[PDB]
Design a protein around this ligand. Sequence first.
Ligand SMILES: [Zn+2]
Lengths: 44, 138, 74, 50, 87, 156, 180
Amino acid sequence: LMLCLYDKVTRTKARWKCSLKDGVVTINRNDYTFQKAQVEAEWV
Amino acid sequence: ASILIGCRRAEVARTFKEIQSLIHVKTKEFGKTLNIMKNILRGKSQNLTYIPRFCSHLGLPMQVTTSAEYTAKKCKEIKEIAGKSPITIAVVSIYLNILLFQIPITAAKVGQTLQVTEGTIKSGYKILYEHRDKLVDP
Amino acid sequence: KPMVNESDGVTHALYPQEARLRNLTYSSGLFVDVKKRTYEGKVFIGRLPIMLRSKNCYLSEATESDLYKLKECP
Amino acid sequence: NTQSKLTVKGNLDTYGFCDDVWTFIVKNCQVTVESVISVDKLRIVACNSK
Amino acid sequence: RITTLDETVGVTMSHTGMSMRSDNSNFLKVMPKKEILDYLFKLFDEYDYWSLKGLKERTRQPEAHLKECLDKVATLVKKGPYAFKYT
Amino acid sequence: HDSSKLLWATEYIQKKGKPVLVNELLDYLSMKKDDKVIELLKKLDRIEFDPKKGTFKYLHSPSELLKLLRSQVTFKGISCKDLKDGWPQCDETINQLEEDSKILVLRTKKDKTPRYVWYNSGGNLKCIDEEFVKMWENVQLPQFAELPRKLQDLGL
Amino acid sequence: SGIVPTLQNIVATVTLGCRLDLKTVALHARNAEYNPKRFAAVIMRIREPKTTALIFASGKMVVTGAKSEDDSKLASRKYARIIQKIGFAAKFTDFKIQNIVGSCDVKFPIRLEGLAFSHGTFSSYEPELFPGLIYRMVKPKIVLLIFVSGKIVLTGAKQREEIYQAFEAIYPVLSEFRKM
Ligand SMILES: [Zn+2]
C-alpha cells in the first residue's frame, strides 16, 4: 500500500503512468520516501 | 461565415485564422454552423486564390505564382490528399518554390508571416523532395 | 509614399498616370505608433490623398527625362 | 525532505477511482530509484493533493 | 519632422494586417448530510450572519450538501435585511 | 433546544407524514426522547397528539372545494395552498370540474397558475367564440347620457 | 461489388434490473473505471469482447466497442456477471442495439467534388474541415462517410443489415464517381 498523493496520470486505454508526490513507497521492509514518482504501469 | 460565404462568392478567399483571429468564435461551432450554410445554400440554390496574396506581403516579382501553381497542381492529382484539412499544404506548394530561389525567406520568416509550424513545413517539404524529380518545368 | 491596395489585396506603389486611367485616388496610408497602458507597435489608421508634385509624391523631384518615362508632362 | 524519484514499470492488475482515490495494484513491477526494484506486489494508493 | 518609410508598402502593412500573431504586448488579454447539518447547525448558531454560500465556502462542503444542511436546524432567509444568513 | 426539538420533530413528523406510534416518533429522529416534545405535541398543532392510539396527522374533494370556494363569499381571497396539500393535484380538478364547477385565478403559465377564491355561474363559457368576444371588444361602449337616447334611437 | 461493410463500432444499451453502487462495482471489479464528477458511469471493459461499458448506478449499461450484436450481448452478459459477483441482483435484460458503425473500402478513388455538387440533398461535404464526405441515406436511415482513399464508414445503424443496405445502395454512387 503506497499511501501517496497523485498529480497527473496519463493513460490511453491500455497503460498507466501514475504521478506521485510527497508520499512513501513500501518495498522489502525499507520505505522509499520520494519527491516525485511516475508509476509507468501497463493494463491487461 | 457569411463573409466566408461572401468572400468565397466574391471569388477571393482568406485563411480561417485570418478570419478566426479576426472574429474569435472558438472555431468549433463556427465551422460546424458554417457547413450547414453551404447545405442551406444548396437547399436554397479552394486554395487557388490564396496564391498571390501569400507572396504579396513579402514583395516578390510576378512569375513566382504560376511557377508555384504548376507545382501546386501536381501534388494532389496522383496521390497525397495531403492535409486532412489540406490548408496546410497550400504553403507547402510555396516553400519548395522559395527553396528553389535564392531569396532568403526561410521558414523563420514564413512561420511568422504565413504562420505554419516547421513540423508541417519540413515534413511537407521533404516528402515533396521525393517527387520533385518530375517537377522540372524549364 | 503613395500606393494602392488592389482587388486581391496586393499593395504596390501607385504612379499618378496609372491613377487617372484606372480611376484610382492618388493617396498614401497613415500609420501611428500607439502606446497602451494598464494602470492600477505601429498601427495603420487610414489613407490620405496627396497633392500632386508635393514633397511626398513620386513626382516630387523627378528628372525631366524621368517625367517623360512616367508619361507626365514637365 | 524528499529527493528520491521512482519509476514503477510493471503490469497493473486492478484499479479503482472513488472519492478521487486511485488504487493501482501492480504485480511483478519494476520501480526505478533515482538501482531498480523488481517488486512483485505493489499497491499504489493515489489520493488527491489538490 | 516625419520620418519617411523606405521599407516597402507591404512590410509596413505586414504588422497592420492579419499576421496571425497577437498578445505581443500584454494589454487586456483576458456529501454527508448530518455532518453538513452539524456544520450548518454550528455555522448558523456560531455565526448568525453565516451565508449559505459562505457556509459552503467555510465548511468547504458542496452547495448541494450545504443547502440541504440548512433546511434541518438552520434558518434560510432569502428576502429582507437578513438575506442569506443562517441562524 | 426546546423550540429546536419541536421544530425538528414537526419537520420529522412532516417528513414521516404518517400516523405511527409515538414511541417510534422519538427513535425516527433520535431527538424527541424527552417529555418536552410530547407536551409540545399536545400543546402545538405542528405535531398531532390525541388520547387515542399513537397517530400524528395534518392539523379534499371538489365538493369541499366548491363549498370552500363558497366559504369565501364577500371575504378575502384565499390561495390553493391548503387545497393542494389537503387534496394533491387540485389544479387538475379545476381543469376537470369546468363550467364554474371549479373556478380559479390563473396568474400565468409559469407558476403553475396559482389560483384564488372564485365562484361563478358559467365560469368558462367557452362556446361563445372569440369572434363574438372580439366584436364585443370591437364595439366600444359609448359615451354619457346621450346613450339612453341612443338605445331609444335603436328602439329600446 | 462483392465488398461487405466491415463493422467498426457497436453501441448498445443494457438494463440490469437493479440499482448499483458504482463505488463497490469499481472496487470489486478488476477491470472498471469510474469518475464521479467527470461522468457518472462505470467504464468497465473486458478484452473478449474488447468492449467499453457505461455502467450507471441506476443500472443502465451502455456497451460500446463491440462490432456485432452478439459480441455486444456477450460483453453485456459478462458485465452483468461481474455485477452479480459482488451481490447486486443484476439481470441481463432489455438489451438493445443503439449504434452500429460499419466500414468498407471500394478501393478506387472517388470524384468527391461532383459527388458533393450532385448530391447536395444526400451528401454532406466540406473538404477543408474534413476531406471525407458524409452521406445520409434515408432508407435505411444510415449515415455514411465517403473518402477519396476509397474507405466508406457507415455508422448509427440499429442493425448491421441497415449498414449493408446503405453500402449496397451507395456503391453505385462510389463507382459512378470513380476517377480512373
Ligand atoms: Zn360616456
